[PDB]
Design a protein around this ligand. Sequence first.
Ligand SMILES: Nc1ncnc2c1ncn2[C@@H]1O[C@H](COP(=O)(O)OP(=O)(O)O)[C@@H](O)[C@H]1O
Ligand SMILES: Nc1ncnc2c1ncn2[C@@H]1O[C@H](COP(=O)(O)OP(=O)(O)O)[C@@H](O)[C@H]1O
Ligand code: BEF
Ligand code: BEF
Ligand SMILES: [Mg+2]
Ligand SMILES: [Mg+2]
Lengths: 733, 66
Amino acid sequence: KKDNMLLVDDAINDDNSVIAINSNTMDKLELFRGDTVLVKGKKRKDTVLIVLIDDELEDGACRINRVVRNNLRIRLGDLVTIHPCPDIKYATRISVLPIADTIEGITGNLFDVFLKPYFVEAYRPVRKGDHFVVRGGMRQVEFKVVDVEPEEYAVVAQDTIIHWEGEPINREDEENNMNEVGYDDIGGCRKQMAQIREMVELPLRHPQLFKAIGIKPPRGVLMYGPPGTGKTLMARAVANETGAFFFLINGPEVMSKMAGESESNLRKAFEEAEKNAPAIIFIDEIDSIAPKRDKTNGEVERRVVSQLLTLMDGMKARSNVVVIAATNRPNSIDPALRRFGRFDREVDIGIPDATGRLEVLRIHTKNMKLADDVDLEALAAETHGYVGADIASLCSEAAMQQIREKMDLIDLDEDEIDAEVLDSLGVTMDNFRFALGNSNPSALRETVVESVNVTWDDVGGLDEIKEELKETVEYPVLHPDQYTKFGLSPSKGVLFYGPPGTGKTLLAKAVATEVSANFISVKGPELLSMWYGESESNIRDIFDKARAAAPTVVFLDELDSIAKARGGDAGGASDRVVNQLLTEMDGMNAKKNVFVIGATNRPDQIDPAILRPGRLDQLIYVPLPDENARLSILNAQLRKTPLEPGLELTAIAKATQGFSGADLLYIVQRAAKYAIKDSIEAHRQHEAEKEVEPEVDPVPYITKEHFAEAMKTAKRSVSDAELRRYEAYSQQM
Amino acid sequence: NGPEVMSGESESNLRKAFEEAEKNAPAIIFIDEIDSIAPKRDKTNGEVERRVVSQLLTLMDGMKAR
Ligand SMILES: Nc1ncnc2c1ncn2[C@@H]1O[C@H](COP(=O)(O)OP(=O)(O)O)[C@@H](O)[C@H]1O
Ligand SMILES: Nc1ncnc2c1ncn2[C@@H]1O[C@H](COP(=O)(O)OP(=O)(O)O)[C@@H](O)[C@H]1O
Ligand code: BEF
Ligand code: BEF
Ligand SMILES: [Mg+2]
Ligand SMILES: [Mg+2]
């Protein structure tokens, strides 16, 4: 460890142009009380200050006031490199300007008042870009050094000419934001960030390493992946981490209404990137530029593609520029633009894992008065399919929920704002839980499923079936250590079969509500279209949305219409659907861990090519309920009902042997209908006896006579031959 | 190569390449990645692909003994 790098500490000396080192630091690095030292911090910024012996400092980190600390874009507890510069000498002239909001109210001679006594006889060591502070006249004004004559940094001796102007600006706040954000604001993408940093650092600063090894540096990088991942943030961080030129052009803004000058715009962009310095070019949204040369019909876009191909190929060794192109979809790319020489190093910035979600959480919400009872580990563990911007939307929705929560009771008084509510603001766990329950992933927005309030105790019976189901779904998405220690490839599909009215759709709803993962549901023949190619493109982009928001559950309901038996046809469309489903279901490796759930009524018409072991091997039979399962169904269907205390369901469980949950629900609904009819008759009788008093309801519970009248027309659902067919299929399989 | 023939100038490029290979010497032409030029003519729906396939057909057929 070279002792030339030190951390930022609080300031004892309240002066602007000063830093404090300890004496044991002075003997460790020769410097003095008058010595003017160059501080170079993060964000590629610098500053100049006077070193002074400080006993309290302790050699390891340095004291600097908040003004110096700001110019370096550092905080208390950040590292900076310190090194002396006496090459700097007395100024010829200086160019400071007051920031508008620090002078709103006053006017007149700022020089005589603030600047004159501030710089006098101190010969301060200033810098271009510095923003210093001067206290006087019952306020503190902030000026920004806009220009000096003696290079970037100089000293303000009494002979130095201080020029101030009355240009109150707003620009510094805007200037800080664009420069703001470097490489510490992007979390969860460490390998791609290191590769991008290498690709912008090594060919641009020192090509001697690549000349020594003998590998030609690439002059082009492509960024693809899901939307809202961080390609634009990476481009902004790369544009801010270097003070070189950054010619920013976009996709559809290179055109013009005159007779063919977009080629001249591309030529002038390339010549302005070539004229100044070895620089970097970021071309955003190249899908509007490259139409893949197949679905285009014009000549102007082909001339644009040819001009960009000629301007991308003709780069010599003395040019030394690289290009960055952000791209949403990775399939509509021109293979002539993907030729060897222009775009070769394609990075894959995918969805983050739990540690990446923790990194983006600790990046985003660390700039607020947050809470006192928060744990981000459970928030990152429960969240599965979010990527990049959805976490920021979650934090914004939590802040808006906190604002809605602390408004109706504390009386904000929207005509004029107070100062009592503003400091008592904390986004607690309840606002984050409400924001988690009131949001959705950005890839599953168009396939949003309406909320069905069912739990794992609402499905009466099927106890061992539901516990092995919740185990075999909860295993491969949260704890992969048992999967790694087992050493066997897992199942990537499951199927339900049995009589209708048994609980397959109810088990699918219980998966959709209480599995702590994502869920996407389609109907059977919904993914078919009369056009050509769309009937397979629907399955293709549905499975693309499934692979994007990993993990998820794709419930293919009623597979007797998609996976129809082949067996003279209508043209071969269902065969194309089955083949597309087979080639989109066979590309399931250990990554992206999706799960396909099927539930049919007739299992004889399912394709053996899709019932093959290795594609969809599991087969859970859901049989008819027994006595105890029927009692559990009758107890779970009567949960939120005002039942009679002197009423038992064991007689209903014993008197019905071949019944099912659907007709049991029909029995309970007919009993409720009879109770509602009795309530209506008692209400109209009470109205007649009042016009010509009981309780709030004359029938507060469902009596035994209502059940005895509802079970009078209680048929059964399934016949006898269907049970024989299902028993024959269960004996065959 | 295949998709480096486009910019009515694909037919001019095909005629230019064939007359250049016929003018100089008895030689050999390498056409790499023919699947872009020949889209199998039934699944395609464009018209400059049909025109450049017809041009390649009438230019490959028009080679004599000399
Ligand atoms: N990987 C990431 N890490 C941190 N913040 C991210 C990430 N991806 C996206 N964001 C956040 O998403 C918001 C907008 O992202 P943006 O750069 O516009 O997305 P993109 O690169 O897809 O165009 C910003 O608030 C940004 O901080
Ligand atoms: N085992 C069960 N426990 C509780 N309710 C059940 C059960 N089986 C069926 N039901 C009821 O049946 C109704 C519809 O059943 P559903 O799942 O759609 O049938 P299927 O098995 O044909 O897909 C729901 O109102 C549900 O409450
Ligand atoms: F990937 Be981002 F939405 F550009
Ligand atoms: F969905 Be069930 F099998 F009627
Ligand atoms: Mg973008
Ligand atoms: Mg169903």
